[PDB]
């Protein structure tokens, strides 16, 4: 049976841990957002054919340029994430994430994931952004970033509403079969 290592990278502001927890438990954790997601594997069926999917978090390692790539070798697929309501995180895809992922794993597929889709239509968030002379990241922006880096897909999701979440990981698998 096919085993799949999937590493999830991006800024603290994406909610990496939350995303993974929300995907795996089928529910936004709500009460308390845990800071720890331990390496996970589980059997799922994709286009019929069952698959063992492996998920590694990278949260905590965002300031450790030489430690993060320890997780990189033998990865079957990367999720490079940015938060849709953080322009900085989006720009970091280009400035930080894609470069180190390519430098170490030149032929490994990347899915570009915009997280926090539920906050893109949120007054308080939008206003918090307007105050810094910024706006949320829109769909054509993600598509164009995806092209620029060689992502096989650009996908949007919310851990909160679960919208696009299952699809993200389905597509992570489809990019390896």
């Amino acid at each position: 049976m096919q085993a799949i290592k999937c590493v999830v990278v991006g800024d603290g502001a994406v909610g990496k841990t939350c995303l993974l927890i929300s995907y795996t438990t089928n529910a936004f954790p709500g009460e308390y957002i845990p800071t720890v997601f331990d390496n996970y594997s589980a059997n799922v069926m994709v286009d019929g054919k069952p698959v063992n999917l492996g998920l590694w978090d990278t949260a905590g390692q965002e300031d450790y340029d030489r430690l993060r790539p320890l997780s990189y070798p033998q990865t079957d697929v990367f999720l490079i994430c940015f938060s849709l309501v953080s322009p900085a995180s989006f720009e970091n895809v280009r400035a930080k994430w894609y470069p180190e992922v390519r430098h170490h794993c030149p032929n490994t597929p990347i899915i570009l994931v915009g997280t926090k889709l539920d906050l893109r239509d949120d007054k308080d968030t939008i206003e918090k952004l307007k105050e810094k002379k910024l706006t949320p990241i829109t769909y054509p922006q993600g598509l164009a970033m995806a092209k620029e880096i060689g992502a096989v897909k650009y996908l949007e999701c919310s851990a909160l509403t679960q919208r696009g979440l299952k699809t993200v990981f389905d597509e992570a698998i489809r990019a390896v079969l």
Binding site: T35, D38, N39, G54, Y64, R66, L67, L70, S71
Partner: protein
């Protein structure tokens, strides 16, 4: 409530880490040092390169650190002191990270399916590679937990600040030690 959620995670995740290192030592490391199974010549007596000082990291967490975090269960606001007390022991993450690339290449180039066979045999969800990244994960994760405590503890909280400073410095030193 938030401070107690975090301490509860700190402790639950510490137990899991100790359980995971233990598993690693008693499956992957044991098979090699046993001489019950036939061992690839590419990796023979290179267990020091594969597992680095993970025995020592396990012993630390299993004999000392988990016992001591437990004592702070009702003292979340003070738990930074735990790290201060035991700062020198965390220097062993520096040695571990240094060795990790060497460990990783070694496994690709010379073990073929040795560890895959053992994984399969024992019925483990975690590969040897999954177990061996954990100390790197864990050493960067402590600082997250302390930041969380800082968001919800009063000015009786330089009993976090100094803990955090230690747990920021360890991973940085480990990071800056890499070739």
């Amino acid at each position: 409530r938030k401070k107690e959620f975090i301490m509860a995670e700190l402790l639950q995740t510490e137990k899991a880490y100790v359980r995971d290192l233990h598993e690693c030592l008693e499956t992957y490391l044991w098979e090699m040092t046993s001489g019950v199974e036939e061992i690839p010549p590419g990796i023979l007596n290179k267990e020091h390169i594969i597992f680095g000082n993970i025995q020592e990291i396990y012993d630390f967490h299993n004999n000392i650190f988990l016992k001591e975090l437990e004592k702070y269960e009702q003292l979340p606001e003070d738990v930074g002191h735990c790290f201060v007390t035991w700062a020198d022991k965390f220097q062993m993450y520096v040695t571990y990270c240094k060795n990790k690339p060497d460990s990783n290449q070694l496994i690709l180039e010379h073990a073929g399916t040795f560890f895959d066979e053992i994984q399969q045999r024992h019925g483990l969800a975690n590969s040897i590679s999954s177990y061996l990244i954990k100390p790197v994960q864990r050493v960067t994760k402590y600082q997250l937990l302390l930041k969380e405590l800082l968001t919800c503890c009063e000015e009786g909280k330089g009993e976090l600040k100094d803990g955090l400073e230690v747990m920021l410095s360890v991973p940085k030193k480990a990071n800056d030690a890499m070739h």
